[PDB]
């Protein structure tokens with residue numbers, strides 16, 4: 001690809017190939033709690049995922065993705081600021097070189113070790129992810145900040161699957177898994193209109209950021225960074241980091257459900 005996270009093809013240079021990178025609805029962002037606007041119009045978040053929709057895990061070079069079958073509404077997200085039902089299709093993570101950083105969103109300037117993203121597309125208005133991907137109200141992503149600490153047992157199945165997709169392009173069946181089990185006990189959240197955090201960077205994401213974080217150990221994070229960005233046979237190139245710096249809010253208002 002013509003983009004990555006290196007010095008030459010990293011976030012700082014993405015605007016040269018993708019001008020929208022300097023847009024008005026870019027993500028992630030720093031959430032300043034003193035400036036958040038509590039909205040009583042926000043309903044609780046509701047997630048109902050069917051473990052049978054889990055499909056495959058893929059090493060995409062810069063990260064790894066766990067995709068789900070999205071032919072129907074067996075797995076959906078509702079409530080919050082949505083009136084329409086959003087269909088789950090994937091979840092993945094972002095992390096940094098060291099524990100000091102790794103998350104994409106930040107709260108009051110505080111950076112966490114990694115971040116979990118659970119993505120969905122508007123199947124109420126659109127017919128496919130491809131169509132919805134570029135629509136202002138096309139995507140919905142739940143972001144969960146991961147604070148380094150005790151090992152998180154709920155990450156086990158995912159972590160155990162990485163040894164099968166070590167190098168770029170590798171992919172394997174990943175089934176019978178319900179990602180709602182990775183979410184924090186409380187679903188209080190913040191929401192704002194944003195975008196994909198990496199190319200194509202479409203400003204089509206309604207973000208749902210959980211107030212409560214989930215844990216992850218230094219060793220578990222080591223496993224993410226142990227993934228390789230090269231194709232099998234070439235010299236190993238560890239996947240050290242894949243988080244984008246926070247972007248300018250530019251007038252946007254972050255709403256709180258609590």
Ligand SMILES: CCOC(=O)CCc1ccc(S(N)(=O)=O)cc1
Pocket residue numbers: 067090117119141195196197198205
């Ligand atoms: C199976 C096809 O998968 C996709 O097209 C995923 C697109 C995609 C969804 C969400 C995000 S993020 N970082 O903004 O949460 C990035 C890229």
Ligand SMILES: [Zn+2]
Pocket residue numbers: 092093094117197
């Ligand atoms: Zn992401």
